[PDB]
Design a binder for these strands. Structure first.
Ligand code: CL
Ligand code: ZN
Ligand code: ZN
Ligand code: ZN
Length: 121
DNA sequence: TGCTTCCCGCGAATAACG
DNA sequence: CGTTATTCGCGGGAAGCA
């Protein structure tokens, strides 16, 4: 089909026929396989570009709107994405958002229409 | 070398099904 | 509808890049 299976120990892995990348979940391999396949297009509704993954388009479109959903809770600065936010918190506040504390807040997306997680309210 | 985008397990929201 | 299958948002490390 589009993959074969591998089994080590009990573990089942799904392997991409084309690039031989390994996946624990089949939904993952299918999501990945569109990169080879290009059977689904995710075109940017603001410009030319097309993406092989829905989430790539979504990150892209937020950069069009300028919305800043990531807010540092120590000083209030807002950021476009996780990486800027984390980078800020680590350098300025000398803390890590990975472990434990709610150091930042992610606002619901309001600059465009995407699926909304009830926990962000 | 520090931004920048990619990656993929995980599971919530929604769609397709019956 | 209830009940499933599907989509895709998210974290945060990795990989890419100039
Ligand atoms: Cl904003
Ligand atoms: Zn592949
Ligand atoms: Zn665009
Ligand atoms: Zn701050």
């Amino acid at each position: 089909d589009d993959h074969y299976e591998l089994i080590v120990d009990g573990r089942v892995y799904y392997i991409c026929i084309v690039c031989k990348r390994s996946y624990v979940c089949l939904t993952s391999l299918r999501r990945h396989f569109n990169i080879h396949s290009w059977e689904k297009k995710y075109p940017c509704r603001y410009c030319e570009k097309v993406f092989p993954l829905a989430e790539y388009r979504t990150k892209h479109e937020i950069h069009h709107t300028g919305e800043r959903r990531y807010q540092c809770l120590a000083c209030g600065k807002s950021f476009i994405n996780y990486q800027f936010m984390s980078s800020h918190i680590k350098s300025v506040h000398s803390q890590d958002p990975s472990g434990d504390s709610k150091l930042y807040r992610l606002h619901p997306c309001r600059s465009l229409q995407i699926r909304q997680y009830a926990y962000l309210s």
